[PDB]
Amino acid sequence: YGAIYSVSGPVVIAENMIGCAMYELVKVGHDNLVGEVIRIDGDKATIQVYEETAGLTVGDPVLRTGKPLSVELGPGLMETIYDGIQRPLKAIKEESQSIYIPRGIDTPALDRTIKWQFTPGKFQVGDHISGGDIYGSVFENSLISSHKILLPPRSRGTITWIAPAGEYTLDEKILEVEFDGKKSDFTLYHTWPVRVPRPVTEKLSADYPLLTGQRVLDALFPCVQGGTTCIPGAFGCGKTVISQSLSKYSNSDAIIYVGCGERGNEMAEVLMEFPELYTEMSGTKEPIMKRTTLVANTSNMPVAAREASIYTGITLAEYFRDQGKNVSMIADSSSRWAEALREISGRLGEMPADQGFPAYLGAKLASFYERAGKAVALGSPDRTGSVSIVAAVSPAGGDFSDPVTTATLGITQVFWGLDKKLAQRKHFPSINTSVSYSKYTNVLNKFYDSNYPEFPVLRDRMKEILSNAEELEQVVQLVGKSALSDSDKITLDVATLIKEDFLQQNGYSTYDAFCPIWKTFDMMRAFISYHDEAQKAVANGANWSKLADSTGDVKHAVSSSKFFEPSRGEKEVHGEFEKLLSTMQERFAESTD
Amino acid sequence: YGAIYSVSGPVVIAENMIGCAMYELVKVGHDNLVGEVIRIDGDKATIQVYEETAGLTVGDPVLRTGKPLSVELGPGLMETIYDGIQRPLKAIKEESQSIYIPRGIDTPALDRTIKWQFTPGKFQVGDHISGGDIYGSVFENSLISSHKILLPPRSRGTITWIAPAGEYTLDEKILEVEFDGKKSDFTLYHTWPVRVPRPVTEKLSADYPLLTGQRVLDALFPCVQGGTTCIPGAFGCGKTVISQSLSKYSNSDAIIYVGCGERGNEMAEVLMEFPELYTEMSGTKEPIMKRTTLVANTSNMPVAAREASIYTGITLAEYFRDQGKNVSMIADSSSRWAEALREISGRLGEMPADQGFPAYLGAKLASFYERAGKAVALGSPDRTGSVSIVAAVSPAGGDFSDPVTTATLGITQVFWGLDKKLAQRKHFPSINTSVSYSKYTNVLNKFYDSNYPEFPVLRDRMKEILSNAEELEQVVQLVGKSALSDSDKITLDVATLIKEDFLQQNGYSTYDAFCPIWKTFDMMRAFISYHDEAQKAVANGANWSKLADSTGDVKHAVSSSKFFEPSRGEKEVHGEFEKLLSTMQERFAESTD
Amino acid sequence: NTVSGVNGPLVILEKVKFPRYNEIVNLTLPDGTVRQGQVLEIRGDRAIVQVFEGTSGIDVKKTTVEFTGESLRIPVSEDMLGRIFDGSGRPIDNGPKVFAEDYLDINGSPINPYARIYPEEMISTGVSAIDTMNSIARGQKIPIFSASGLPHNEIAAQICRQAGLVRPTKDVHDGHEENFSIVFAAMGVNLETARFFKQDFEENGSLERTSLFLNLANDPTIERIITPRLALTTAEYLAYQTERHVLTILTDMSSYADALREVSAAREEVPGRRGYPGYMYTDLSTIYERAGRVEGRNGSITQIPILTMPNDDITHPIPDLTGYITEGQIFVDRQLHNKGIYPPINVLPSLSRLMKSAIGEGMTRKDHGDVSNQLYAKYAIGKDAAAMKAVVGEEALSIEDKLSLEFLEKFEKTFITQGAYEDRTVFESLDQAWSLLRIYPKEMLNRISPKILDEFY
Amino acid sequence: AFIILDEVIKVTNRRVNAIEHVIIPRTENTIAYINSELDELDREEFYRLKK
Amino acid sequence: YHSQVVGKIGYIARCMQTIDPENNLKKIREDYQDVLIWAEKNYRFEEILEASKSGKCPNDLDALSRRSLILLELLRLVSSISPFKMKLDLIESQYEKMKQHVNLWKSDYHVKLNQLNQLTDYLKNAAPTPKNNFLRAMTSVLQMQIAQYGITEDNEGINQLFKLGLHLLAMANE
């Protein structure tokens, strides 16, 4: 064991180290504080401890763990709240009587006091086994298995002992593998380092559609299962409704919410709001909490859980994606991780970079976005999995030209910006073609257009009218309404209702939170049909104010058809949107004559 | 004490520190140069040399002065010009015959040839003494005495030696304190550090107004005595005219002028203009120079006097406020002190800050503005005193977003702007309705209305006519000259006569410098009654030129009322306004018909 | 040992590293002054400590060392309410001692009472513009963003004076279930503003139930920076220990950030953007972390700090990190205060984090969030229509911009127009906003439900 | 001619008021933050090289 | 801390002894018995600092400055009325009336004492003009009427004499 020579701030120096490394985590002091050896100077190694140094005496023993900081992979991840450092937050409420552990909290990462239902998979005695194969399953979902028991990576052999169906503990072993002699005993919990990526057979292109729960987001530029999305904006852009809509209205088998720099109130509101919401796929009691995994942090929490929150969430998302289920990762935000890396770079005494941020934010940000994505699941079964990483960003320097927003936005393939002018009107998010871009919308429109889509023309026409609405509003604001024609006024009138109804996606009730493709395609088709009918009635003889004031509640009923849940019509297309086309077609004939 | 280890540039490095503090000033080498230990790194101490380091070699001794870097406070400060480092300007003008201090000066901060008569106080032998009590009195003025001999801070005990009355010098002792044996020797003058403020018994809210003599300044936004006021300078916009007019026209007992970064012509003009002009308090034998203190440092002198000029003026203003007299602190400017502190910070090798200024500029600027104010005298004798901090804020670096002007503007609660066109227009100050503002007008109107004010009713009506005329000028320019009504011409005509009579002042006679509160109170009531009688007379049927020609000498006498003597009613009330109210009431019937 | 060196407010001493981190050290000099401080850095045969008493005048080979044996912690007790104290934790009246009974660390919370349920209890303060446009909850941190030349101390004194009188009528409404307490923290403020806030605290009746910290610009920045952690530790210890709702007002954030920037250039830490320190997220994260519900379901810690701009720009790291880290913000406009509006609360960039989950049943209505969102969108569209009507004209604009232009003019001088001692409930703000909101048709109003919009326009 | 000048003056005053009202503040506010960011970026490289 | 309390107690006892040497003020001296008890016997600085450290004596700066302001205003009013003398019952009634007033710093008593002190200070170093003789006679009659009628009564003769002396002091040599 080493001896602590000096402790100044969040960094501690311990001499007599012969087992220290650059990414290995160890425990310093008698309280078992969470820390890791970042660098070494001669015979002593400098260890940066994210925990509070108030109450740690100089001269205590330091024992290195001999491996990097990782998390436990097994049954018990869903329905439990933990931190980014792989610590149990549920045990702190019983033992310490607090939400977060302030200091001196030595608890296990995996729960070993509860029993789970262990059932056998598609393997038996005498069959070959490999790393990533489905060795078992646990009933922890609505109608399917959630926590699938898989073997560790970089291992193989034959299953000598297979446990039967029943309840067992995490500390008890029910699996035995024989490969070149007695290899080791297998249990429910497994170890995996968070500083190394999860193994896989091969990576594939993302070609599956994903529901984000937003009419303007899915209508403007929808994402795929396995893509990277960046969301800039000062003071957020509606990450609560977008995060809850991605878990509730999302079509993924697993949902992972990770908070690296949250205050704690939004994570408690989103965590408590998950048990009240019912699953729409024939779920059970606590359906959203059983298939959701939450990693809660604090503003004054440890830097090891904040920086390791994206690594543990990406490792848990890769472990859930390795079994064959679709996982969605909602991270908020990367600016707290970049500021935590800049605080570690400034406190450690390393050379800084431009814009006050460290030089490892580009490689760590590119490795964090590169660690997620869609690919083939590792193992003998060869299942299909996907990991959608959605990380929002904020302006740390006060502008959109910083290295944090440009570094995360440059490596990402999908973008969803936020306009301050549209955000000031109580509409979040607000971007049509100036802050939003996506390359998978062409392949993503093939399936939604394959079912019953009209979004392929209405998305380009709505993006063209939304992009031309700012250019018409600039000349209309600068010069006035005297140098513009009636077509630009009708296009600005349709862009005002399309921006008011499409940009507003906050929701004032339970029916204003889900946004299907049929409702957005019907509203965009009705707005495009009203915009084409206004141009045809203006070309056949008519006025713009007589067309908009002549329409009135015909467009007001289409704008007001977002405060009810879809339970009428065929499956999701109510008759109010179907009769709006006949009412607009009947009003278009009377508007001409 | 220490030995010279090396000399590189304007800073000197001396080793062998065996107790030398980082706040004590000493002379390095055998030239007796001005310097102070700013920092210390190991055995070698870093001292900044504010003088020429020519002729200094390694291996020279460093003799400490035996105390911290401060200024001497005693009799003889009035009718003398010195620097911020407490350098004798009259001694340099007598010996060297120049206005610049030479290199290697080691003379005292006060003259010893001018003896004063010391008189004993009410303290006798046997009674205990303490810091703050008035131990005696010494003459410091040309005719009367205003310098009260009090006990210095950090001292207490019994009066073991009671010196009798008679004439003595500053070097000779007249008092001795006995506390724990031989504590120290007492004299007429005392030493105090410029980096520590003078302690008092308790602070109180300032509600007394500054006796300056401005009718528009006291009427529109009266700056009280003891508040923080900031003014934006332009180096020729009217900054020296307000200090020269405020020094001569002011009737305060004490005055402190602080020149930090002036060019040299304004200090010579203010220094030579003081003995030629007389005061309004009936002073004789140089009343303007005897009641004022001159602290003028040019832009070609060392930065120790420019940086210590605000601390010496704040310490002398704190001692003058502790003595029981009211002193007005006029400083110009804070940008020269911030640039002098940034030059010493950049030359010393410290870490820089935003905008090139040091990090301690905000704490020193906040402590300088927070140090002044109205308070009670320390010790058992409670006296009434006030310290008004009126510091100009010039531009630095060619920008307007620096924290010097923004921090001084946000920290202060009173503002008085100056315009280049207003100084050429013979306006003092150059702010009519949009260049000045004050938040302490409620307490100043409660106190000035507490004595015998009628300014509380016409205070908003005085600025309302100028805001109505200034708002009507843009409507008359853009809308048209014929769009205004008859009430706007009477309001603009009343605001033109009120602004020309009140704001229009350049010291034409002896009644334009000193202005009482009764003439400024009746002057606003005469213009308010003339505007109300003009609006009521025009509302009953009349013309604008017929109403102005119907007024005639009634409105013409109010503009020429400032040329008359201020002793009209008893000694301060204008008797022409009392009969002019009944004359305007009798002329209001002839103006309508 | 002795002081090896001194650079600014931090002095490097040759003491051993046997003592723990954050332990108090006493320096004994021959000049007749004793200075106490905490060890900021520990090493082998060397240490760096920041003293809270004295700035200059530290001897090198004449200083002594003393081991106190106690960590740097503010003693919080129930007897501190009713006396004037300083920022370092010393009374200025020369009265009794602190008499602290519990130990609370200033660097991070020592309990970590993160509430797992979001707050839904609306806390009123007597302002229809603040509480109506921004939904407040039990423990929601909402800062006030001001600039140079704005009266933020008058709005903080009006919020402190108005906070304490609505608690008796709000106690029966189920909005509050505990007593109300105030937290007074002043750093870099004038004596007239501290006496003006003390007159509002004595007039409101919170002088015997709150602690005052007097910090000026003449003391050290290390002693002034310890005042917000002691005030937040006393407010969190009293709110968690007593089960009462405590509102803490800490002004100003620029004076506390100036001590961190001044204590960042002399150290080995690299500065950030705009000349500020690179570790401002760790210092601001400690103050921002102490906010929300407490353990027991009966207490909370609400923070209402006043943040003034040091340069009058919207690109600073203090306003961007403080506005993004908080759950809302209150914008102040110079045109509203210069025009004659009181209080100058801007509703254009003003937005709250909780608008649909902070109002409950019994003390607030359900249409307050839709009326606040419709008033915010109508205020922004009325501001853009007022700028287009001021630039181009009302004749060139359409008929839709005239209703928002008149609604912004009526709501600018009707909604945000209030006195300095008059209170307004949240229920009257919806009925008062419903009369001003009835200027447009039902088709143009789309920020509310059709039942509440059809039942009341 | 009077009807032409009365129609031209309303366009000229609105164009001059719109351009004069919209001209300076975005370029000045962007130039100040660009100068401050260039000053901080110029200061950080000298601080690291001095360290 | 302790030096302001010991210097305030010794300065209060020395000011009370310098105000009245006969010791005929039992009403004003009755309230100051706790401060005169430490000055009328053997009491060092360690006993006053030790008794003030435990809250066994007055240690408030606002209460000590407010209580010392009445003795300073009474000593300044009794000292500014020289060479005329005032009665002990009139000084006790003026001290009791000034002690019962909420304002003792913004009242007209300190402004009237400062106005009489400016005329006495201007008359103590006056030039050889008739305004110093007429202002000296009017200041002597105003001092005799002010000492005879007290500072608590707002007579028209003291205001007319103070207005005539203040108007004569503002005059020049022409």
mmCIF file of C-alpha atoms in Angstrom, chain C residues 86-173:
data_model
loop_
_atom_site.group_PDB
_atom_site.id
_atom_site.type_symbol
_atom_site.label_atom_id
_atom_site.label_comp_id
_atom_site.label_asym_id
_atom_site.label_seq_id
_atom_site.Cartn_x
_atom_site.Cartn_y
_atom_site.Cartn_z
ATOM 1 C CA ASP C 86 -19.933 39.268 9.219
ATOM 2 C CA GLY C 87 -19.057 37.132 6.210
ATOM 3 C CA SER C 88 -16.375 35.146 8.034
ATOM 4 C CA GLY C 89 -18.768 34.295 10.873
ATOM 5 C CA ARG C 90 -18.074 37.001 13.454
ATOM 6 C CA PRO C 91 -20.598 39.463 14.911
ATOM 7 C CA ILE C 92 -20.056 43.158 14.246
ATOM 8 C CA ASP C 93 -22.078 44.350 17.263
ATOM 9 C CA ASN C 94 -19.549 42.802 19.668
ATOM 10 C CA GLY C 95 -22.341 40.728 21.186
ATOM 11 C CA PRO C 96 -22.487 37.029 22.063
ATOM 12 C CA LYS C 97 -20.733 34.118 20.334
ATOM 13 C CA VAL C 98 -22.086 32.092 17.402
ATOM 14 C CA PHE C 99 -22.922 29.047 19.561
ATOM 15 C CA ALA C 100 -23.005 26.493 16.738
ATOM 16 C CA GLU C 101 -24.053 22.924 17.479
ATOM 17 C CA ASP C 102 -23.693 21.148 14.115
ATOM 18 C CA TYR C 103 -20.789 20.931 11.671
ATOM 19 C CA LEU C 104 -21.438 21.742 8.009
ATOM 20 C CA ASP C 105 -18.726 21.644 5.359
ATOM 21 C CA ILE C 106 -18.494 24.575 2.956
ATOM 22 C CA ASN C 107 -17.034 22.554 0.048
ATOM 23 C CA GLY C 108 -20.015 20.450 -0.999
ATOM 24 C CA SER C 109 -23.059 19.340 0.964
ATOM 25 C CA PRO C 110 -22.364 16.903 3.838
ATOM 26 C CA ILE C 111 -25.742 15.114 3.678
ATOM 27 C CA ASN C 112 -26.732 15.263 -0.005
ATOM 28 C CA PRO C 113 -30.528 15.489 0.433
ATOM 29 C CA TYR C 114 -31.500 15.186 -3.225
ATOM 30 C CA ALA C 115 -35.292 15.011 -3.422
ATOM 31 C CA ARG C 116 -36.659 12.292 -5.712
ATOM 32 C CA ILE C 117 -39.991 14.112 -6.255
ATOM 33 C CA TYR C 118 -40.302 17.369 -8.173
ATOM 34 C CA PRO C 119 -41.777 20.359 -6.299
ATOM 35 C CA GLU C 120 -45.405 21.160 -7.056
ATOM 36 C CA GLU C 121 -46.137 23.542 -4.167
ATOM 37 C CA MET C 122 -46.374 27.095 -5.485
ATOM 38 C CA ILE C 123 -44.622 29.594 -3.200
ATOM 39 C CA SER C 124 -46.003 33.119 -3.519
ATOM 40 C CA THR C 125 -44.034 36.329 -3.006
ATOM 41 C CA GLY C 126 -46.431 39.200 -3.764
ATOM 42 C CA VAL C 127 -45.596 39.838 -7.435
ATOM 43 C CA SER C 128 -48.020 39.143 -10.278
ATOM 44 C CA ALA C 129 -45.335 39.597 -12.941
ATOM 45 C CA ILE C 130 -42.717 37.315 -11.353
ATOM 46 C CA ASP C 131 -44.962 34.513 -10.101
ATOM 47 C CA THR C 132 -47.359 34.752 -13.054
ATOM 48 C CA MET C 133 -44.816 34.664 -15.889
ATOM 49 C CA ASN C 134 -42.494 32.209 -14.090
ATOM 50 C CA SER C 135 -43.883 29.339 -12.023
ATOM 51 C CA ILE C 136 -42.200 29.047 -8.622
ATOM 52 C CA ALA C 137 -41.911 25.869 -6.564
ATOM 53 C CA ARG C 138 -40.644 24.802 -3.150
ATOM 54 C CA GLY C 139 -36.878 24.931 -3.654
ATOM 55 C CA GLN C 140 -36.690 26.176 -7.261
ATOM 56 C CA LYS C 141 -33.570 28.262 -7.928
ATOM 57 C CA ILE C 142 -34.532 31.306 -10.013
ATOM 58 C CA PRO C 143 -31.870 34.025 -10.417
ATOM 59 C CA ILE C 144 -32.363 37.634 -11.480
ATOM 60 C CA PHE C 145 -30.260 38.767 -14.449
ATOM 61 C CA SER C 146 -29.488 42.498 -14.391
ATOM 62 C CA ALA C 147 -26.953 44.861 -15.946
ATOM 63 C CA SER C 148 -24.996 47.995 -15.098
ATOM 64 C CA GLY C 149 -27.360 50.771 -14.060
ATOM 65 C CA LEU C 150 -30.335 48.615 -13.044
ATOM 66 C CA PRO C 151 -32.000 48.549 -9.607
ATOM 67 C CA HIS C 152 -31.665 44.862 -8.751
ATOM 68 C CA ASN C 153 -31.349 45.681 -5.043
ATOM 69 C CA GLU C 154 -34.776 47.344 -5.102
ATOM 70 C CA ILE C 155 -36.328 44.230 -6.658
ATOM 71 C CA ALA C 156 -34.505 42.002 -4.165
ATOM 72 C CA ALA C 157 -35.598 44.228 -1.276
ATOM 73 C CA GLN C 158 -39.151 44.253 -2.643
ATOM 74 C CA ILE C 159 -39.084 40.456 -2.964
ATOM 75 C CA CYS C 160 -37.680 40.144 0.560
ATOM 76 C CA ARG C 161 -40.242 42.580 1.974
ATOM 77 C CA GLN C 162 -43.124 41.001 0.049
ATOM 78 C CA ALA C 163 -41.913 37.499 1.016
ATOM 79 C CA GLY C 164 -43.319 36.901 4.489
ATOM 80 C CA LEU C 165 -46.788 38.436 4.334
ATOM 81 C CA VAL C 166 -48.369 36.029 1.831
ATOM 82 C CA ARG C 167 -47.334 33.030 3.947
ATOM 83 C CA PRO C 168 -50.238 33.410 6.430
ATOM 84 C CA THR C 169 -52.934 33.462 3.745
ATOM 85 C CA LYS C 170 -50.972 30.913 1.702
ATOM 86 C CA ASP C 171 -50.740 28.566 4.699
ATOM 87 C CA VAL C 172 -54.475 27.853 4.513
ATOM 88 C CA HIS C 173 -54.298 27.504 0.716
#
